Amino acid sequence: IVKETDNIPIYENLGAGGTAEVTPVYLCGAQALAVAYAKRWKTVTEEFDYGDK
Amino acid sequence: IVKETDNIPIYENLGAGGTAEVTPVYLCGAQALAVAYAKRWKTVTEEFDYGDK
């Protein structure tokens, strides 16, 4: 399954003669990346400046 | 009654020839020191930087 992802970087000066632009394509399967969470994303609120901010 | 207190300072190079070390011994009777307590020791807690600190 080939997926169109806009965030893949493009590198300059790595091509033939230094003019061409190089892009990577990543073919992954199971157990490709590992994300470890010591604390999941959380939202907190605080008051500042005598409760004005 | 002579008591050893580990925190009596030793002063460097105050002896003969600028090399020996000098230490004080304190002999105390009644009404030696006065301690005034406007407020005793208290423990407080605070949170800073959106709870980070």
Nearest Cα to Cα of residue B3 among B21, B22, B23, B26: B26
Which residue is listed with tokens 């033939």?
A16
- Which residues from A are below 8 Å from B50, CB to CB? 44, 46
Cα of B52 to nearest chain A Cα, Å: 10
Q: Experimental technique used? A: cryo-EM
DSSP A8-50: ---EES-SGGGTSEE-------TT------SS---------TT
* Residue B11 CB-half CA count within 13 A: 8
What whole-number distance in Å separates Cα of residue A53 and Cα of residue A45? 11
Resolution in A: 3.2
**Facing residues of B22 across strands?**
B11
- Which residues from B are below 8 Å from A44, CB to CB? 50-51
**Rounded to whole angstroms, what are the CA distances from B36 to B25, B33, B40, B43?**
24, 10, 10, 19
* A·B CB contacts under 8 A: 4
CA angle A26, A33, A12 (to 5 degrees): 40
